[PDB]
Design an enzyme around this catalytic site. Structure first.
Site, PDB file in Angstrom:
ATOM      1  N   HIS A  13       0.854  -1.100  -0.185  1.00  0.00           N
ATOM      2  CA  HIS A  13       0.182  -0.045  -0.083  1.00  0.00           C
ATOM      3  C   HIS A  13       0.595   1.364   0.000  1.00  0.00           C
ATOM      4  CE1 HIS A  13      -3.928  -1.606   0.072  1.00  0.00           C
ATOM      5  NE2 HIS A  13      -3.724  -2.442   0.897  1.00  0.00           N
ATOM      6  N   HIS A 105      -3.384  -2.811   8.273  1.00  0.00           N
ATOM      7  CA  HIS A 105      -4.619  -3.056   7.133  1.00  0.00           C
ATOM      8  C   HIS A 105      -4.920  -1.742   6.579  1.00  0.00           C
ATOM      9  CE1 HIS A 105      -7.305  -5.854   5.262  1.00  0.00           C
ATOM     10  NE2 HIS A 105      -8.137  -4.761   5.633  1.00  0.00           N
TER      11      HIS A 105
END
Ligand code: NA
Length: 112
Positions: A13, A105
Site C-alpha cells: 500500500h 491493514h
C-alpha cells in the site's frame, strides 16, 4: 507479528514512486508489491514516506482503526481487463487498522 504485518502493508500500500512515474500495469502484476497475489480487482497506493503513514498510529494502542489527520496523494488501480488497469489519483484521508504503532491493514479511503 505486527512488524511483519507492517512490512506487508508497506509493500502492498505504500509507494516510493511519484504519481507520474507510478504504473498500475507494472505494480499490480509485480509479486514484489502484491503480497496477497497479483492482478487484484483493486488496490490503493499511498504516495508517501513510511514515517507519516506510521504516525497515523502514534496515539493508537491495541488493535484499532484510525483515520489519518492529513490527506495523502493516492493512486487507485482498478477494473482490470486481463490485468490491465484503469489508473487514477486523488487526495484523501485514509482509514487504517493500527496494531499499536504499526499500520497493519488498509480499511478504506476517507475517514474511518
Ligand atoms: Na481531496
Amino acid at each position: 507479528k505486527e512488524d511483519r504485518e507492517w512490512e506487508k502493508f508497506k509493500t502492498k500500500h505504500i509507494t516510493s514512486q511519484s504519481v507520474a512515474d507510478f504504473n498500475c500495469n507494472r505494480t499490480m502484476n509485480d509479486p514484489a508489491y502484491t503480497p496477497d497475489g497479483q492482478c487484484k480487482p483493486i488496490n490503493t497506493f499511498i504516495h508517501s514516506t513510511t514515517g507519516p503513514v506510521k504516525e497515523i498510529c502514534r496515539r493508537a494502542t491495541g488493535r484499532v482503526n484510525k483515520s489519518s489527520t492529513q490527506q495523502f496523494t493516492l493512486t487507485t488501480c482498478k477494473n482490470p481487463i486481463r490485468c490491465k488497469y484503469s489508473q487514477s489519483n486523488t487526495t484523501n484521508f485514509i482509514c487504517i487498522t493500527c496494531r499499536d504503532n504499526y499500520p497493519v491493514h488498509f480499511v478504506k479511503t476517507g475517514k474511518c
